[PDB]
Amino acid sequence: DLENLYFQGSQINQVRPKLPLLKILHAAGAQGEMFTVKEVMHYLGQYIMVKQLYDQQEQHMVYCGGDLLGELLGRQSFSVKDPSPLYDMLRKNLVT
Ligand SMILES: COc1ccc(C2=N[C@@H](c3ccc(Cl)cc3)[C@@H](c3ccc(Cl)cc3)N2C(=O)N2CCNC(=O)C2)c(OC(C)C)c1
């Protein structure tokens, strides 16, 4: 089966975060250094919640400036409604 052959070694698609992003996931309670992209998103959400980087009024708004997360994103702020910067950062900080 060629479809089986193609997908072998590639059915979970784990990533190894680059060291600064790994430190963020660890601060949100992650362990080890291999994750699914779904796990990375869970831990990043948790990180923002535990470091209180969101705005209690406009909870879609993240103020990451002066946090390690802001350094990785190259931003002072972002909205979960317009998550382009997060896509960019994860493309650069997740290794297959
Ligand atoms: C209107 O209020 C909302 C609405 C949605 C999100 C959100 N939306 C989820 C989400 C957003 C963008 C992408 Cl690309 C993926 C997932 C996910 C998330 C995951 C990673 C990051 Cl870096 C930020 C947010 N994410 C969350 O982490 N949420 C889910 C909703 N409530 C929560 O308890 C936490 C949200 O996130 C806060 C952490 C800012 C707040």
Primary descriptors:
Protein Mdm4, alpha+beta, 5 helices, two-stranded antiparallel ribbon, 96 residues, 5 strands, MDM2, binds ligand NUT
Give an overview in words.
Helices cover 47% and strands 15% of the residues. With 96 residues, it is α+β, with helices and mostly antiparallel strands. The chain has one domain: SWIB/MDM2 domain (MDM2, Orthogonal Bundle), CATH 1.10.245.10. The strands form 2 sheets. The protein has a 3-stranded antiparallel β-sheet. A two-stranded antiparallel sheet has the order 3-4. Helix 2 crosses helix 3 (37-50). The structure holds the ligand COc1ccc(C2=N[C@@H](c3ccc(Cl)cc3)[C@@H](c3ccc(Cl)cc3)N2C(=O)N2CCNC(=O)C2)c(OC(C)C)c1. The site of the ligand COc1ccc(C2=N[C@@H](c3ccc(Cl)cc3)[C@@H](c3ccc(Cl)cc3)N2C(=O)N2CCNC(=O)C2)c(OC(C)C)c1 has 12 residues, from helix 3. This is Protein Mdm4. It is found in: Nucleus. Belongs to the MDM2/MDM4 family. Interacts with MDM2. Interacts with TP53, TP73 and USP2. Found in a trimeric complex with USP2, MDM2 and MDM4. Interacts (phosphorylated) with YWHAG; negatively regulates MDM4 activity toward TP53.
